[PDB]
Design a protein around this ligand. Structure first.
Ligand SMILES: O=C(c1cncc2cc[nH]c12)N1CCC(=C2c3ccccc3CS(=O)(=O)c3ccccc32)CC1
Ligand SMILES: O=C(c1cncc2cc[nH]c12)N1CCC(=C2c3ccccc3CS(=O)(=O)c3ccccc32)CC1
Lengths: 301, 301
């Protein structure tokens, strides 16, 4: 038993991390087959980022201006184009360590593992969730651009996130592997800001089910409440609305503990109105919304 | 910026996890060179565990009673011996993916990454700290025995933990890779209980430093204090004593933030005596003690 923020094993992704250097800037790239993916802002100076015409800046770049280094073997760039905000550098060597992979665009609320890398070398791995405002609360220092987020579904690695930037509030924004930013953010130095975040309600409920499975049961009561009257309480405390799809998703968790989904919502109602009163749930004094229902089933059985 | 529980990349360790089968029991083994390491309770039936004589039980097992499977590659066992509480199966094939490794015995308060495995296949990775009572608050299910804990010092993997059992309180106990249990626990079905746990003071201080590095300064005060005056408050709240060695370790962190250790101690003293008043630090409403000063420096720079 026990419940931890658990990342996927990073081995299959470590073998795809390379170093990409453009002039004086070094960041991380993702080497899949004969392509290296990285954030396009590698080609920008600090002056360019005030107002970058990326099409024009990339035109001033030649194939020989990009230095890709896989460990100690230099990969020769034979082609470069721009797909949205990612730069795809075609190289003369297919990665022999290329796993079965897929590029996916996740929805807010879903989670993924982050392989934080610096200079093409992995530094650590941790779990993140796409927030409702399309940011992630990660751990990224300078040099970490190009680090990727992923899930391992069956035997296939689903890449979903590539790190691009940190916002003034300390949260992080990036794109999918086709170059499309999650959210309204852009890769330039402007006054962009993360909108008001909300709590992922279906995730908190799955975490409470994880708490019940692991013995923590003090917050359970005999009350109940309709889906409509719970959402009224959820709006005042900045929680996402709970839909019937959400209740269907929580089916396996509800059917496992014998506690109905709506009965769990009544317990969450009481925790929001009163608080925890100095108690803890799964070692936490706050309600945790970064575990999807999939994450709980994968870890609790 | 940002601060997350960050595990080491697990790729080097994944290539060493194998499946060990003895009769109807299957658990995980560690394949380094031509030796496979796994818990010795693999040879035991449920009835054996009430009072196991491991020398006698191993005496009736032959080499052919042990099946080792590295994925789909069967490794034939040519030798078996018992070192303390671990079984060493000598196999006919050296592991071609063996990394530069070392067996280390960590001290209470240190942290490590855990690669949770089932049937020789990795499931996930997360960070754990050796508690002062020599337990860990991990996430393990049935079949996870033989999963290992490790740190990655330079290019060398320092194996420090192998999982053996879950205690009644939901915490977990295991051995080092030489078979010696952390703590007083034994691999038999008896009334085992973890001792009183305490809070790792030097880790909380490093964490508050991490918080200051991240911009959380609301707890910083104008008052200072002394070591004995701080330890007096620490002893009342189940906190481990603060030594000068601890203050030496907090050198780089104190020398980087501008706050002195004793000045951070007075801030912690006030947090213990008064509480956090519903405020949060680094997204937590509780004081965190599972980050060593090394972990903070590695992550914050
Ligand atoms: O390396 C991190 C990094 C990544 N993640 C977290 C942190 C924390 C500190 N640095 C971090 N860069 C922050 C994001 C970067 C840029 C950028 C790109 C090219 C040239 C200059 C700059 C500086 S820019 O400010 O104009 C800016 C503005 C908007 C979007 C991107 C960028 C690169 C460095
Ligand atoms: O697979 C997990 C496992 C590992 N980690 C967490 C969980 C949660 C559920 N199961 C978990 N085994 C629990 C630990 C085990 C044993 C054991 C070993 C051989 C034969 C029987 C038994 C059952 S025993 O109870 O007599 C016992 C008592 C003391 C020490 C070890 C053991 C094996 C299964």
């Amino acid at each position: 038993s026990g419940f931890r923020k658990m990342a996927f094993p990073s081995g299959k992704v470590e073998g795809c991390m390379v170093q990409v250097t453009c002039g004086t800037t070094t960041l991380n790239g993702l080497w899949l087959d004969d392509v290296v993916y990285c954030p396009r802002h590698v080609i920008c100076t600090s002056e360019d980022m005030l107002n970058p015409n990326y099409e024009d800046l990339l035109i001033r770049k030649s194939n020989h201006n990009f230095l890709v280094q896989a460990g100690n073997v230099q990969l020769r760039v034979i082609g470069h184009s721009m797909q949205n905000c990612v730069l795809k550098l075609k190289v003369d060597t297919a990665n022999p360590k290329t796993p079965k992979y897929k590029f996916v665009r996740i929805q807010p609320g879903q989670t993924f593992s982050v392989l934080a890398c610096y200079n093409g070398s992995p530094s650590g791995v941790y779990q993140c969730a796409m927030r409702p405002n399309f940011t992630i609360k990660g751990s990224f220092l300078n040099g970490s651009c190009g680090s990727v987020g992923f899930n391992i579904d069956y035997d296939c690695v689903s890449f979903c996130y590539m790190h691009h930037m940190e916002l003034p509030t300390g949260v992080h924004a990036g794109t999918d592997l086709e170059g499309n930013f999650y959210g309204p953010f852009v890769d330039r130095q402007t006054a962009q800001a993360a909108g008001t975040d909300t709590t992922i309600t279906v995730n908190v409920l799955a975490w409470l089910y994880a708490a019940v499975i692991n013995g923590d049961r003090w917050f359970l009561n005999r009350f109940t409440t309709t889906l409509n009257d719970f959402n009224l309480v959820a709006m005042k405390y900045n929680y996402e609305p709970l839909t019937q799809d959400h209740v269907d998703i929580l089916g396996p968790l509800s059917a496992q503990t014998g506690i109905a989904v709506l009965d769990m919502c009544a317990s969450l109602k009481e925790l929001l109105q009163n608080g925890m009163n100095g108690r803890t749930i799964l070692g936490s004094a706050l309600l945790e919304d970064e575990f999807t229902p999939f994450d709980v089933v994968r870890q609790c059985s």
